[PDB]
Amino acid sequence: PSTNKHLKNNFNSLHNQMRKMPVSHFKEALDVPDYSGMRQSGFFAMSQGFQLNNHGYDVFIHARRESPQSQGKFAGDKFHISVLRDMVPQAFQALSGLLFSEDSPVDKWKVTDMEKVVQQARVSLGAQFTLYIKPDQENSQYSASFLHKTRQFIECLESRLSENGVISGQCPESDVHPENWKYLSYRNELRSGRDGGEMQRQALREEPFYRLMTE
Structure with a gap:
């Protein structure tokens, strides 16, 4: 069963299991570089x-854990x-x-x-941070x-930004987000493109991963 199919088949169950879990704690790393660093x-x-x-190749600074914590294969989320x-x-x-936690x-x-940056308004006037998520289990589920x-982490990022007085930027039309997310947005790169549109957004709102993060 693919990553997506597994979520679709067990949606309500996963949804109910998540509702019973306690607050997730994230120890904050103190010795971390600032933006200039x-x-x-x-x-x-x-x-x-x-x-x-x-x-050099792109317009981003990259970060990757040396000893990964998710063993599954990337599924586009x-x-x-x-x-x-x-x-x-x-x-x-x-x-x-939180990012270095x-x-x-x-x-x-x-x-x-x-x-x-050259003329990439999409990732400069908005979408300046990109977070990759992958199934944690070896079987890619x-x-x-x-x-x-993951949902707790995303909600933590939202809280942290609001608490620091940050103002929202331009959400990419390729992404979707509920009304309560003021900075975060989502897309699955295996089933959508970087070019937004109502058709794509309507399609993204049914992604079971997205639904589990919002409903």
Whole structure:
């Protein structure tokens, strides 16, 4: 059973299992680079077990856990965080403790390097952070506990940004999000494109992963 099919077949059950779990705690990493430090990554740097680099092919600074915590194969689920462009450094500082946390469910993420930007309004005026999520089990299926941890993490990011006074940016038309998410948005890259549209958004709202994160 594919990752997506497994979620679809067990939706209500997973949904009910998640509802009984306790608050997820994320120990915040203190010795972490600030936005400027991230840009200093170059060809290689390490921090809190995350390999860092910003050497060149794209407009982002990359972060990947050396010892991954999710053993399944990537199934396309990813999030974006949109804030005012000039607030990216502040937003990064507000979220670094969580992004580098030894308890974070995100093994891989990226943030736009504002100095490398050309005319990519999509990831500069919005969607400046990208979070990759992958099934935790070796069999590539999501466990209810991991889904809960992931939803709790995303809600933690939302709380942290609001608590720091960050203002939302331009949400990518390729993504979908409930009214209560002011900065976060979602899309599955295996079943959607970076080019938004009402058709795509209506299709994304039925993704079982998205439904488990919002309903």
